[PDB]
Design a protein around this ligand. Structure first.
Ligand SMILES: Nc1nc2c(ncn2[C@@H]2O[C@H](COP(=O)(O)OP(=O)(O)NP(=O)(O)O)[C@@H](O)[C@H]2O)c(=O)[nH]1
Ligand SMILES: N[C@@H](Cc1ccccc1)C(=O)O
Ligand SMILES: [Mg+2]
Ligand SMILES: [Mg+2]
Ligand SMILES: [Mg+2]
Ligand SMILES: [Mg+2]
Ligand SMILES: [Mg+2]
Ligand SMILES: [Mg+2]
Ligand SMILES: [Mg+2]
Ligand SMILES: [Mg+2]
Ligand SMILES: [Mg+2]
Ligand SMILES: [Mg+2]
Ligand SMILES: [Mg+2]
Ligand SMILES: [Mg+2]
Ligand SMILES: [Mg+2]
Ligand SMILES: [Mg+2]
Ligand SMILES: [Mg+2]
Ligand SMILES: [Mg+2]
Ligand SMILES: [Mg+2]
Ligand SMILES: [Mg+2]
Ligand SMILES: [Mg+2]
Ligand SMILES: [Mg+2]
Ligand SMILES: [Mg+2]
Ligand SMILES: [Mg+2]
Ligand SMILES: [Mg+2]
Ligand SMILES: [Mg+2]
Ligand SMILES: [Mg+2]
Ligand SMILES: [Mg+2]
Ligand SMILES: [Mg+2]
Ligand SMILES: [Mg+2]
Ligand SMILES: [Mg+2]
Ligand SMILES: [Mg+2]
Ligand SMILES: [Mg+2]
Ligand SMILES: [Mg+2]
Ligand SMILES: [Mg+2]
Ligand SMILES: [Mg+2]
Ligand SMILES: [Mg+2]
Ligand SMILES: [Mg+2]
Ligand SMILES: [Mg+2]
Ligand SMILES: [Mg+2]
Ligand SMILES: [Mg+2]
Ligand SMILES: [Mg+2]
Ligand SMILES: [Mg+2]
Ligand SMILES: [Mg+2]
Ligand SMILES: [Mg+2]
Ligand SMILES: [Mg+2]
Ligand SMILES: [Mg+2]
Ligand SMILES: [Mg+2]
Ligand SMILES: [Mg+2]
Ligand SMILES: [Mg+2]
Ligand SMILES: [Mg+2]
Ligand SMILES: [Mg+2]
Ligand SMILES: [Mg+2]
Ligand SMILES: [Mg+2]
Ligand SMILES: [Mg+2]
Ligand SMILES: [Mg+2]
Ligand SMILES: [Mg+2]
Ligand SMILES: [Mg+2]
Ligand SMILES: [Mg+2]
Ligand SMILES: [Mg+2]
Ligand SMILES: [Mg+2]
Ligand SMILES: [Mg+2]
Ligand SMILES: [Mg+2]
Ligand SMILES: [Mg+2]
Ligand SMILES: [Mg+2]
Ligand SMILES: [Mg+2]
Ligand SMILES: [Mg+2]
Ligand SMILES: [Mg+2]
Ligand SMILES: [Mg+2]
Ligand SMILES: [Mg+2]
Ligand SMILES: [Mg+2]
Ligand SMILES: [Mg+2]
Ligand SMILES: [Mg+2]
Ligand SMILES: [Mg+2]
Ligand SMILES: [Mg+2]
Ligand SMILES: [Mg+2]
Ligand SMILES: [Mg+2]
Ligand SMILES: [Mg+2]
Ligand SMILES: [Mg+2]
Ligand SMILES: [Mg+2]
Ligand SMILES: [Mg+2]
Ligand SMILES: [Mg+2]
Ligand SMILES: [Mg+2]
Ligand SMILES: [Mg+2]
Ligand SMILES: [Mg+2]
Ligand SMILES: [Mg+2]
Ligand SMILES: [Mg+2]
Ligand SMILES: [Mg+2]
Ligand SMILES: [Mg+2]
Ligand SMILES: [Mg+2]
Ligand SMILES: [Mg+2]
Ligand SMILES: [Mg+2]
Ligand SMILES: [Mg+2]
Ligand SMILES: [Mg+2]
Ligand SMILES: [Mg+2]
Ligand SMILES: [Mg+2]
Ligand SMILES: [Mg+2]
Ligand SMILES: [Mg+2]
Ligand SMILES: [Mg+2]
Ligand SMILES: [Mg+2]
Ligand SMILES: [Mg+2]
Ligand SMILES: [Mg+2]
Ligand SMILES: [Mg+2]
Ligand SMILES: [Mg+2]
Ligand SMILES: [Mg+2]
Ligand SMILES: [Mg+2]
Ligand SMILES: [Mg+2]
Ligand SMILES: [Mg+2]
Ligand SMILES: [Mg+2]
Ligand SMILES: [Mg+2]
Ligand SMILES: [Mg+2]
Ligand SMILES: [Mg+2]
Ligand SMILES: [Mg+2]
Ligand SMILES: [Mg+2]
Ligand SMILES: [Mg+2]
Ligand SMILES: [Mg+2]
Ligand SMILES: [Mg+2]
Ligand SMILES: [Mg+2]
Ligand SMILES: [Mg+2]
Ligand SMILES: [Mg+2]
Ligand SMILES: [Mg+2]
Ligand SMILES: [Mg+2]
Ligand SMILES: [Mg+2]
Ligand SMILES: [Mg+2]
Ligand SMILES: [Mg+2]
Ligand SMILES: [Mg+2]
Ligand SMILES: [Mg+2]
Ligand SMILES: [Mg+2]
Ligand SMILES: [Mg+2]
Ligand SMILES: [Mg+2]
Ligand SMILES: [Mg+2]
Ligand SMILES: [Mg+2]
Ligand SMILES: [Mg+2]
Ligand SMILES: [Mg+2]
Ligand SMILES: [Mg+2]
Ligand SMILES: [Mg+2]
Ligand SMILES: [Mg+2]
Ligand SMILES: [Mg+2]
Ligand SMILES: [Mg+2]
Ligand SMILES: [Mg+2]
Ligand SMILES: [Mg+2]
Ligand SMILES: [Mg+2]
Ligand SMILES: [Mg+2]
Ligand SMILES: [Mg+2]
Ligand SMILES: [Mg+2]
Ligand SMILES: [Mg+2]
Ligand SMILES: [Mg+2]
Ligand SMILES: [Mg+2]
Ligand SMILES: [Mg+2]
Ligand SMILES: [Mg+2]
Ligand SMILES: [Mg+2]
Ligand SMILES: [Mg+2]
Ligand SMILES: [Mg+2]
Ligand SMILES: [Mg+2]
Ligand SMILES: [Mg+2]
Ligand SMILES: [Mg+2]
Ligand SMILES: [Mg+2]
Ligand SMILES: [Mg+2]
Ligand SMILES: [Mg+2]
Ligand SMILES: [Mg+2]
Ligand SMILES: [Mg+2]
Ligand SMILES: [Mg+2]
Ligand SMILES: [Mg+2]
Ligand SMILES: [Mg+2]
Ligand SMILES: [Mg+2]
Ligand SMILES: [Mg+2]
Ligand SMILES: [Mg+2]
Ligand SMILES: [Mg+2]
Ligand SMILES: [Mg+2]
Ligand SMILES: [Mg+2]
Ligand SMILES: [Mg+2]
Ligand SMILES: [Mg+2]
Ligand SMILES: [Mg+2]
Ligand SMILES: [Mg+2]
Ligand SMILES: [Mg+2]
Ligand SMILES: [Mg+2]
Ligand SMILES: [Mg+2]
Ligand SMILES: [Mg+2]
Ligand SMILES: [Mg+2]
Ligand SMILES: [Mg+2]
Ligand SMILES: [Mg+2]
Ligand SMILES: [Mg+2]
Ligand SMILES: [Mg+2]
Ligand SMILES: [Mg+2]
Ligand SMILES: [Mg+2]
Ligand SMILES: [Mg+2]
Ligand SMILES: [Mg+2]
Ligand SMILES: [Mg+2]
Ligand SMILES: [Mg+2]
Ligand SMILES: [Mg+2]
Ligand SMILES: [Mg+2]
Ligand SMILES: [Mg+2]
Ligand SMILES: [Mg+2]
Ligand SMILES: [Mg+2]
Ligand SMILES: [Mg+2]
Ligand SMILES: [Mg+2]
Ligand SMILES: [Mg+2]
Ligand SMILES: [Mg+2]
Ligand SMILES: [Mg+2]
Ligand SMILES: [Mg+2]
Ligand SMILES: [Mg+2]
Ligand SMILES: [Mg+2]
Ligand SMILES: [Mg+2]
Ligand SMILES: [Mg+2]
Ligand SMILES: [Mg+2]
Ligand SMILES: [Mg+2]
Ligand SMILES: [Mg+2]
Ligand SMILES: [Mg+2]
Ligand SMILES: [Mg+2]
Lengths: 82, 393, 60, 85, 205
RNA sequence: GCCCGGAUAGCUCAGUCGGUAGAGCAGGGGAUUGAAAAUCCCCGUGUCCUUGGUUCGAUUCCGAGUCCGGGCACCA
RNA sequence: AAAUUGAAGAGUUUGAUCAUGGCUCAGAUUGAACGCUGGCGGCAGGCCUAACACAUGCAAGUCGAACGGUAACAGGAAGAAGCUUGCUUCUUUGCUGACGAGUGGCGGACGGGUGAGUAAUGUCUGGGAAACUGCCUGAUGGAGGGGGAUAACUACUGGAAACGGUAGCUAAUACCGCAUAACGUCGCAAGACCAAAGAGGGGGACCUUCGGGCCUCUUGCCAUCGGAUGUGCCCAGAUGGGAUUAGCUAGUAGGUGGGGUAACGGCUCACCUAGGCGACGAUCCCUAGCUGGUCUGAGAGGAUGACCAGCCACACUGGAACUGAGACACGGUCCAGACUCCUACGGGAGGCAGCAGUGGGGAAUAUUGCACAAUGGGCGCAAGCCUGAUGCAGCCAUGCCGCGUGUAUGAAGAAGGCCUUCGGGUUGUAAAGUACUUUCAGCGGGGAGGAAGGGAGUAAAGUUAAUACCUUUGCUCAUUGACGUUACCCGCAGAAGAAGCACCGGCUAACUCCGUGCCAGCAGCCGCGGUAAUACGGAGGGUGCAAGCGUUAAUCGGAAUUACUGGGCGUAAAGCGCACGCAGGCGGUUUGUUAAGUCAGAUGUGAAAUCCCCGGGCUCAACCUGGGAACUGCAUCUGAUACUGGCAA
């Protein structure tokens, strides 16, 4: 099963997640098909915070790829009309 | 290493003293089987007190073995000393930690040369109390012969400066109590009563900072190097900073579990024999004689002034003068060490039976402070007691 | 191998376990090592002040 | 061993007792056709083929045998019946 | 981390006045400058080509108060940056906060300005800064916080800055201890004495 | 934790059963050379591993140690 | 708009010289070690050697919404008995919630670890058909009617234990028929043949025989054709060293036919032919995980493959298969072997190259910590449980990077040291002294951000006979942090707690004086020391780095000293003693003509990280991070014909 999940990079106490389309069996930081945006929880109100390319999500979710508990919330965060 | 040791009943360090082949080790075995059966503690046996090839083909004991027998009032911790003339060095370590001895004189042979040598070492080191035990009895079926030996022991103790006539002498066979004779089982149950009555609750130093002299080092397969010894002062909590000071140099370390006869502890209090497990130390690099101190409290020294009291023929020591360059053995807390003597100006010779101060350069540095008590020995016998005056290094 | 004993005076004799580093002396032909003064049974040089990491001596 | 999922040891042993018996049954019905092949006309061989055809297809559906295994034992075995007889 | 030794000794060895012990008084005349580096001060040096490079490097270090490890890092940034390697070396040094705080006149010496930066006095763009090495970006506003504003060391040290040349690239208010760093410093604006070319020559080999 | 061996002037070795230890090879002093090497003329240059004891007297006889050698064990 | 801005020499053969040519040195760099000295912090890292041997706890379970269990356990409900009639005793009740032990599902094959083997079975780059694919996901349509078992539990025994047997007994999504089946499988087609499992949340109406049936809805089950993701297999080139290894090879090389493989194949057989590889290095021997990269370099190259990422390989040693969608299975099974193991002598264990930790080896390398709070993973509708994966914490200057250790004034140019032509100089504004700070430690108080959620509510929607239940939801509640005495802030006290260690003859920045006398010692190269040492030892003085500094080892550089870019061979090292000559390298000249080379274009690809440039975020930096460029390539496809090749003439 392909799944859209966060990768967890960044320094100690300073996380930075690469949301990424990968196989369930592969490790968190390991193999993936292609990365599809990112997430930064320690960004705060500034220029950049969270980006998520919604065109590539239709190629995976439309076919048959699950979305993780956190990445599903960021699709709600980016919104369809807000 | 599983069952947690509950801190109930005061801890007391007991141990057997006496002549060679006199019932000293066999007494220890009798005390276990007697106290385990009636009260209902842990059993154990005689063979465990001394196995190895060295204590089987021979029969004699070398190593200071330990035993843990419990009674309603107190929790005793035994120290079975060797006894022979060859093994006085590893005895003194066992005798120093011991609070109240159990002397062993026998009704057939009576007081013999080592009994005098053992009690002499007991005084100068630190043996407050002592209890006699006649360890044959049955072999000579007589009322007059057995009681004449009791008289000579009272004389021995009182001559060498102990209470003597006040000490509770006990009679009883060690081998008869090993099997199951009702009269002889009860007579060594009586010795447990004499231990509670005569010896008081010992005075500990649970206030001034941590110190622990190492009596014997181990290497436990799985956990690491362990050091045993009575905690001279202070306490030991698990995961605390501990500095090892003495011979060679000085090394930083941390405690990772204290124990009491293969049982876990939280706080290793003062005045009780405990096995401290140190972190990241090899078997060879940590040797016997070194002390587990709290960092900063004590510093290793190779030179010091000290008020030495030399002994005379009557008290038992040297009987001739000596000059700078003389090298005897200085027994501090556990181990001994050799050192050159440098006398003060205006003192041509040191006569026997005299009070003087002197600078002593030791070959190995040992951890010491001002007001530490030591006993000088040389040539298989005592020489002089004393105290440390000033640090130099 | 043979190894040079630098500094003035040494405690080495018969046996005594010592540490060896690389370095030719360029005078004794064949001797192509140096004993590390301070490490193991090889002690420091007695009464040195200048250059004491070389020769393994502590502060005064 | 040092695990409570040793059920799979006794469960897999329990499987192959069953799994070998249904497998052994299948390959004997296939042997029954190869026995009929050699000295025989188109009559006895095709009777054995009609008997094993339901058994080989069935065992393929249960995941014992793969569907291509079953497909060959029809493909090659019909070719022995058709070419010789 | 810092020098913290005899400071005017460094000036005699180098020869020229390094502004290490500039302080309240203008001119020193209290060290036998030039002709006494040490005991053997009367010894005229032969001074090789490697010497003059090393002397010029050690001069620029000791003026700005930077060690070789951090100074060699300025060269590595200076090489990668555009323009000229020589001009980049010194432009990056001048952009330090302890150097800017000195040039504004909030510190008699550069070591005083460094301590003033380190001890939570200095504040830039509404944010306190402790780091002397803080690269002051173009268009900034360094200043002193209101708790430590108009303390005894700063008011006297600001009167010294009137006698100084005063840079064109930065401006100072002087009333409320508020500075304004505007553009990057030009080569011809400052110094006109410390050679950059010889420092580029030391590191390239 | 205990059994055993080993140590003699700068180096390699003799000498002892209490009678106070020597040999070569070095090293040093002088005449000679810038200093040497030889040449010539004179010297052991010593805590008998350390220290104590039995004695009139101990390298030598008997303890206790030093660092090193090899041997056997104990698992809070 | 930005993506390379890049190439240094010096000492040393000689009385001197120019050349040749080694030797050494100045720079980067590390998984480092060692010596001396050690304040903090931040981010990284931390058994390279014995793939040596291992005690202890722990690293994989999970659902009651599969099933018997009316339950091992703890607790409500119809009813019971004592007596302080609600306090106590106590049988029934899926019936209180759940769940010890089972039975079945899915997991255990992922995640972790380590490079022993492997020089090609492997890896890389680019292609290619003969394939399979649990979970996810498109479509179509099923799922109908039966049976015999079987554990647990008893019952009864065997065993020291591990672990059984014998008598029942019973449940299912376990199990097997049967009907049922096609664009499915097979056949030339006609034909034949091939499956399923059921659950849970609610109900008006009417059957009640009360176990309700039947509407409901979510989820599962089953067949096919599919996507997606994995994996299996094939080819081409590339991927170390040795010819003081020259021949190797019989299922070997190919065919026909049978078997077997998910799939094709000497995969494997039977016969048939006599091959196949080999000088563009087979075979044999030694060494080796491989790549993205790393370090170095002006670049070509040279070295290297710790950490992060992909692939392979292996799991106590040597084998085999079972189960499964996937293993010939790290914490499964079965044998055998070596070593530890416990017993009752019958027999049993056991597998740290999961995480801690031990001994041993070594120059050398760490806690038997906390936590699932986040991020993934496993099962489950979920809640949650599980997780040494991950996130933290401890230790270690092992690195990279930041801030420390005061800051002004200060002449008697003090004392003391050190030097002197004894006039003085120098240490030295150094110190003391006065003026000030108060970072960081040390105390005392504020306090984020890592937190998205999940639940009890609800609202309309969803959904239906229904103002239900689930799908989506938006509003009200009270909560979720191992880190944590957190990041950071603010008050306190007072310079207070906070500096070494190399070197100083030349190369190479910096000099005197004493001690010693080819001795003691130094030395990276040359070389210093023989009684006036700048080189030895100390002292003063300096210089260079500074919480580091040096020494050692290791790679490249300089070395144009293996030279493709870029060297030579009369006398310095170096033309075989001289011919002939096959294979091989090269080839006059003009027409053709292809298009192999070559060149141009175009598309696909060259994983991500790394590097590089412009940004951005941590007080700054290292560090993290967005986008770009790049990934110098390889493939195919279209062209160009000058050159080179081919084929003619
Ligand atoms: N007849 C008899 N013999 C006894 C008695 N107690 C002890 N013994 C014997 O005396 C001998 C001494 O043995 P043991 O006690 O081990 O010696 P020890 O007293 O420890 N001295 P060491 O350890 O120095 O040899 C043994 O043979 C023992 O059986 C007793 O009461 N009666
Ligand atoms: N305290 C220890 C004493 C001991 C020491 C050494 C051996 C045995 C016992 C117990 O155990
Ligand atoms: Mg894989
Ligand atoms: Mg937020
Ligand atoms: Mg006797
Ligand atoms: Mg005994
Ligand atoms: Mg005896
Ligand atoms: Mg007798
Ligand atoms: Mg007698
Ligand atoms: Mg440890
Ligand atoms: Mg097993
Ligand atoms: Mg088994
Ligand atoms: Mg099955
Ligand atoms: Mg069969
Ligand atoms: Mg069969
Ligand atoms: Mg049929
Ligand atoms: Mg089945
Ligand atoms: Mg199946
Ligand atoms: Mg630094
Ligand atoms: Mg720094
Ligand atoms: Mg260069
Ligand atoms: Mg001579
Ligand atoms: Mg002479
Ligand atoms: Mg002479
Ligand atoms: Mg002479
Ligand atoms: Mg003369
Ligand atoms: Mg001489
Ligand atoms: Mg470049
Ligand atoms: Mg050169
Ligand atoms: Mg040169
Ligand atoms: Mg020559
Ligand atoms: Mg030369
Ligand atoms: Mg010359
Ligand atoms: Mg020349
Ligand atoms: Mg180190
Ligand atoms: Mg070190
Ligand atoms: Mg060390
Ligand atoms: Mg730190
Ligand atoms: Mg870390
Ligand atoms: Mg390893
Ligand atoms: Mg192995
Ligand atoms: Mg092992
Ligand atoms: Mg065990
Ligand atoms: Mg184990
Ligand atoms: Mg536990
Ligand atoms: Mg476990
Ligand atoms: Mg239920
Ligand atoms: Mg339910
Ligand atoms: Mg299944
Ligand atoms: Mg793995
Ligand atoms: Mg990992
Ligand atoms: Mg891994
Ligand atoms: Mg491991
Ligand atoms: Mg690797
Ligand atoms: Mg490939
Ligand atoms: Mg490829
Ligand atoms: Mg490809
Ligand atoms: Mg399918
Ligand atoms: Mg399945
Ligand atoms: Mg699922
Ligand atoms: Mg689906
Ligand atoms: Mg469907
Ligand atoms: Mg029907
Ligand atoms: Mg029917
Ligand atoms: Mg039915
Ligand atoms: Mg039925
Ligand atoms: Mg049935
Ligand atoms: Mg039945
Ligand atoms: Mg049955
Ligand atoms: Mg049934
Ligand atoms: Mg089924
Ligand atoms: Mg029918
Ligand atoms: Mg039928
Ligand atoms: Mg039917
Ligand atoms: Mg029908
Ligand atoms: Mg039909
Ligand atoms: Mg049909
Ligand atoms: Mg049909
Ligand atoms: Mg078909
Ligand atoms: Mg067909
Ligand atoms: Mg049809
Ligand atoms: Mg059915
Ligand atoms: Mg079924
Ligand atoms: Mg049901
Ligand atoms: Mg129901
Ligand atoms: Mg109903
Ligand atoms: Mg569905
Ligand atoms: Mg489904
Ligand atoms: Mg498909
Ligand atoms: Mg599918
Ligand atoms: Mg398969
Ligand atoms: Mg690279
Ligand atoms: Mg580089
Ligand atoms: Mg470069
Ligand atoms: Mg080059
Ligand atoms: Mg390689
Ligand atoms: Mg390699
Ligand atoms: Mg490496
Ligand atoms: Mg590794
Ligand atoms: Mg790591
Ligand atoms: Mg790792
Ligand atoms: Mg990896
Ligand atoms: Mg692969
Ligand atoms: Mg593969
Ligand atoms: Mg494998
Ligand atoms: Mg494997
Ligand atoms: Mg393993
Ligand atoms: Mg195996
Ligand atoms: Mg195997
Ligand atoms: Mg499966
Ligand atoms: Mg199978
Ligand atoms: Mg399959
Ligand atoms: Mg496994
Ligand atoms: Mg296996
Ligand atoms: Mg695995
Ligand atoms: Mg394991
Ligand atoms: Mg296994
Ligand atoms: Mg066999
Ligand atoms: Mg076996
Ligand atoms: Mg076995
Ligand atoms: Mg491990
Ligand atoms: Mg270890
Ligand atoms: Mg070791
Ligand atoms: Mg270390
Ligand atoms: Mg825990
Ligand atoms: Mg919890
Ligand atoms: Mg989770
Ligand atoms: Mg699930
Ligand atoms: Mg589900
Ligand atoms: Mg667990
Ligand atoms: Mg844990
Ligand atoms: Mg650090
Ligand atoms: Mg270190
Ligand atoms: Mg100070
Ligand atoms: Mg000052
Ligand atoms: Mg001052
Ligand atoms: Mg002061
Ligand atoms: Mg003041
Ligand atoms: Mg303050
Ligand atoms: Mg203040
Ligand atoms: Mg603070
Ligand atoms: Mg505090
Ligand atoms: Mg929230
Ligand atoms: Mg929070
Ligand atoms: Mg929810
Ligand atoms: Mg809810
Ligand atoms: Mg609710
Ligand atoms: Mg609701
Ligand atoms: Mg708090
Ligand atoms: Mg907490
Ligand atoms: Mg103050
Ligand atoms: Mg101070
Ligand atoms: Mg003199
Ligand atoms: Mg002389
Ligand atoms: Mg001489
Ligand atoms: Mg001499
Ligand atoms: Mg030197
Ligand atoms: Mg010469
Ligand atoms: Mg001279
Ligand atoms: Mg002189
Ligand atoms: Mg000289
Ligand atoms: Mg030099
Ligand atoms: Mg010198
Ligand atoms: Mg010197
Ligand atoms: Mg200086
Ligand atoms: Mg200095
Ligand atoms: Mg460093
Ligand atoms: Mg270094
Ligand atoms: Mg090197
Ligand atoms: Mg080269
Ligand atoms: Mg080279
Ligand atoms: Mg040449
Ligand atoms: Mg030629
Ligand atoms: Mg020649
Ligand atoms: Mg030639
Ligand atoms: Mg010729
Ligand atoms: Mg010839
Ligand atoms: Mg050609
Ligand atoms: Mg040609
Ligand atoms: Mg041509
Ligand atoms: Mg040709
Ligand atoms: Mg031509
Ligand atoms: Mg033409
Ligand atoms: Mg033409
Ligand atoms: Mg043409
Ligand atoms: Mg053409
Ligand atoms: Mg054409
Ligand atoms: Mg072409
Ligand atoms: Mg073409
Ligand atoms: Mg064409
Ligand atoms: Mg081409
Ligand atoms: Mg091209
Ligand atoms: Mg092209
Ligand atoms: Mg890339
Ligand atoms: Mg590169
Ligand atoms: Mg920034
Ligand atoms: Mg900024
Ligand atoms: Mg980036
Ligand atoms: Mg990018
Ligand atoms: Mg691009
Ligand atoms: Mg790349
Ligand atoms: Mg590349
Ligand atoms: Mg390309
Ligand atoms: Mg091509
Ligand atoms: Mg083409
Ligand atoms: Mg064409
Ligand atoms: Mg042409
Ligand atoms: Mg041509
Ligand atoms: Mg042509």
């Amino acid at each position: 099963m392909v799944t859209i999940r966060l990768a967890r990079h960044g320094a100690k106490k300073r996380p930075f997640y690469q949301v990424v389309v990968a196989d369930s069996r592969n490790a968190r930081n390991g193999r993936f098909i292609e990365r599809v945006g990112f997430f930064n929880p320690i960004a705060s109100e500034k220029e950049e915070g969270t980006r998520l390319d919604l065109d590539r999500i239709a190629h995976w979710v439309g076919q048959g790829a699950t979305i993780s508990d956190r990445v599903a919330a960021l699709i709600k965060e980016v919104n369809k009309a807000a | 290493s599983k069952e947690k040791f509950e801190r109930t009943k005061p801890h007391v360090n007991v141990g057997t003293i006496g002549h060679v082949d006199h019932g000293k080790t066999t007494l220890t075995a009798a005390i276990t089987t007697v106290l385990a059966k009636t009260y209902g503690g842990a059993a154990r046996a005689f063979d465990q007190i001394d196995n190895a090839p060295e204590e089987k083909a021979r029969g004699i004991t070398i190593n200071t073995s330990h035993v843990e027998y419990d009674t309603p009032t107190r929790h005793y911790a035994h120290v079975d000393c060797p006894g022979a003339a060859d093994y006085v060095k590893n005895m003194i370590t066992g005798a120093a930690q011991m609070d109240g001895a159990i002397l062993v004189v026998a009704a057939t042979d009576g007081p013999m040369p080592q009994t005098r040598e053992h009690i002499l070492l007991g005084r100068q080191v630190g043996v407050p109390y002592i209890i006699v035990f006649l360890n044959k009895c049955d072999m000579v079926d007589d009322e007059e012969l057995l009681e004449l030996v009791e008289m000579e022991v009272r004389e021995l103790l009182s001559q060498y400066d102990f209470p003597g006539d006040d000490t509770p002498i006990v009679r009883g066979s060690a081998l008869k109590a090993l099997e199951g004779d009702a009269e002889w089982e009860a007579k060594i149950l009586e010795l447990a009563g004499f231990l509670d009555s005569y010896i008081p609750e010992p005075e500990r130093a649970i206030d001034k900072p941590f110190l622990l002299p190492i009596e014997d080092v181990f290497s436990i397969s799985g956990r690491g190097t362990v050091v045993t010894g009575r905690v001279e002062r202070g306490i030991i909590k698990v995961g605390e900073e501990v500095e090892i000071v003495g011979i060679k140099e000085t090394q930083k370390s941390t405690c990772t579990g204290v124990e009491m006869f293969r049982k876990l502890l939280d706080e290793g209090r003062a005045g009780e024999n405990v096995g401290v497990l140190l972190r990241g130390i090899k078997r060879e690099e940590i040797e016997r004689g070194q002390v587990l101190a709290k960092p900063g409290t004590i510093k290793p020294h190779t030179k010091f002034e000290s008020e030495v009291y030399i002994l005379s023929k009557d008290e038992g020591g040297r009987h001739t003068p000596f000059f700078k360059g003389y090298r005897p053995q200085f027994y501090f807390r556990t181990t001994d060490v050799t050192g050159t003597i440098e006398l003060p100006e205006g003192v041509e010779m040191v006569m026997p039976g005299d009070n003087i101060k002197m600078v002593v350069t030791l070959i190995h540095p040992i951890a010491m402070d001002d007001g530490l008590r030591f006993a000088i020995r040389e040539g298989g016998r005592t020489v002089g007691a004393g105290v440390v005056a000033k640090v130099l290094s | 191998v043979t190894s040079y004993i630098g500094g003035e005076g040494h405690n080495l004799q018969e046996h005594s376990v010592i540490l060896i580093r690389g370095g030719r002396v360029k005078d004794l032909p064949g001797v192509r090592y140096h004993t590390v003064r301070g490490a193991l049974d090889c002690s420091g040089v007695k009464d040195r002040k200048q250059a004491r990491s070389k020769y393994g001596v502590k502060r005064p | 061993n040092i695990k409570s999922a040793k059920k799979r040891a006794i469960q897999s042993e329990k499987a192959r007792k069953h799994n070998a018996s249904r497998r052994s049954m299948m390959r004997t019905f296939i042997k029954k056709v190869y026995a009929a092949i050699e000295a025989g006309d188109k009559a006895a061989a095709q009777k054995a083929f009609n008997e094993m055809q339901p058994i080989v297809d069935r065992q393929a559906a249960k995941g014992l045998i793969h569907k291509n295994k079953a497909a060959r034992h029809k493909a090659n075995l019909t070719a022995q019946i058709n070419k010789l007889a | 981390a810092r020098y913290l030794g005899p400071k005017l000794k460094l000036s005699r060895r180098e020869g020229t006045d390094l502004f290490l012990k500039s302080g309240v008084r203008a001119i020193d005349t209290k060290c036998k400058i030039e002709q006494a580096p040490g005991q053997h001060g009367a010894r005229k040096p032969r001074l090789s080509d490697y010497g003059v490079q090393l002397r010029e490097k050690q001069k620029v270090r000791r003026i700005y108060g930077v060690l070789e490890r951090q100074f060699r890092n300025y060269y590595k940034e200076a090489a990668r940056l555009k323009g000229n390697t020589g001009e980049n070396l010194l432009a990056l040094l001048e952009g330090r906060l302890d150097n800017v705080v000195y040039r504004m006149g909030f510190g008699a010496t550069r070591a005083e300005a460094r301590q003033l930066v380190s001890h939570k006095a200095i504040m830039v763009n509404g944010r306190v800064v402790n780091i002397a090495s803080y690269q002051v970006s173009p268009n900034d506003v360094v200043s002193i916080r209101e708790k430590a504003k108009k303390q005894s060391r700063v008011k006297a040290a600001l009167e010294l800055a009137e006698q100084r040349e005063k840079p064109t690239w930065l401006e100072v208010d002087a009333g409320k201890m508020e500075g304004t760093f505007k553009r990057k410093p030009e080569r011809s604006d400052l110094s006109a004495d410390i050679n950059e070319h010889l420092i580029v020559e030391l590191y390239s080999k």
